[PDB]
Design a protein around this ligand. Structure first.
Ligand SMILES: Nc1ncnc2c1ncn2[C@@H]1O[C@@H]2COP(=O)(O)O[C@H]2[C@H]1O
Length: 201
DNA sequence: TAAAATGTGATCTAGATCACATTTTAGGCAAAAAAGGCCTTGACATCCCACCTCACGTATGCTATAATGTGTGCAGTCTGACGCGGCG
């Protein structure tokens, strides 16, 4: 259907894991699409500490904020959650096929609207809640993300203390201690990498 | 000038620090073994085949008082023109 006509035009590259997608500040000259896999968008500070922006699954056009004004840059890092086949688009051609077909910026209305909605409650939560609420609702939303697997009492997922410390804006063993308290509160099971939340659905 | 904004500062309060030992656990590399894919075996079940197989059916033969030329149930006749064979 629609997607067939647009993949008919695209140029593709295969991405290994562990590496960089976007380099912040450089010339933004291409839009991409997640052909297969998952990715983690994030950003550094002056000191170099990472702080995660989000994860992203299938159904995502990628590297879009540079599409629009002449002479823009990359406003964030994007790092490998997994190995990912990824597409290629130029911007003059973006003018061409937005003009002869308006459904792609209808799609990008979809995705970008989701992204500043989810970001709207990212910052909205970033003001007020406490670390309990931060990591709690974090792992709720990751329980909504399809990367988690089904456990017969809920949802299981595999992650370390460091990266969730880079989610909620605090240190890793802090979330370790309140995590073990949360175990003692009987709302999770937890063996090392593999953690599980019940109460889903 | 009504009504919202602006200083008192001492007394606190949930997380970050910070070097180093110990887990784990990947993830991914070598693989043991089991369960399909490959074949076989024994055992069964059902036949196809045909090979027979007797009962019932069927092809054929005579019957010696004597008897000896149909018909047989119909048609109802339409009619005007054209060929042809007699017909003088
Ligand atoms: N708040 C956000 N939500 C989703 N994606 C983002 C956000 N900020 C940056 N990005 C992505 O990170 C990319 C970095 O380079 P760009 O600015 O060209 O395009 C950006 C987006 O694709």
């Amino acid at each position: 259907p629609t997607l067939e006509w647009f993949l008919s035009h695209c140029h593709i590259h295969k991405y290994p894991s562990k590496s960089t997608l976007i380099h912040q500040g450089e010339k933004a000259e291409t839009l991409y699409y997640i052909v297969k896999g998952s990715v983690a968008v994030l950003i550094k500070d002056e000191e170099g500490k990472e702080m995660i922006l989000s994860y992203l699954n299938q159904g995502d056009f990628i590297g879009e904020l540079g599409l629009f004004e002449e002479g823009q840059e990359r406003s964030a890092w994007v790092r490998a959650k997994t190995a990912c086949e990824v597409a290629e688009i130029s911007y003059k051609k973006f003018r061409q096929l937005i003009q002869v077909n308006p459904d792609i910026l209808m799609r990008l209305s979809a995705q970008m609207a989701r992204r500043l909605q989810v970001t709207s409650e990212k910052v909205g939560n970033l003001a007020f809640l406490d670390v309990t609420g931060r990591i709690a609702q974090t792992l709720l939303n990751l329980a909504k993300q399809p990367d988690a697997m089904t456990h017969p009492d809920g949802m299981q997922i595999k992650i370390t203390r460091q990266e969730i410390g880079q989610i909620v804006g605090c240190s890793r063993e802090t979330v370790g201690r309140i995590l073990k308290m949360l175990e003692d509160q009987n709302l999770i099971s937890a063996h090392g990498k593999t953690i599980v939340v019940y109460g889903t659905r």
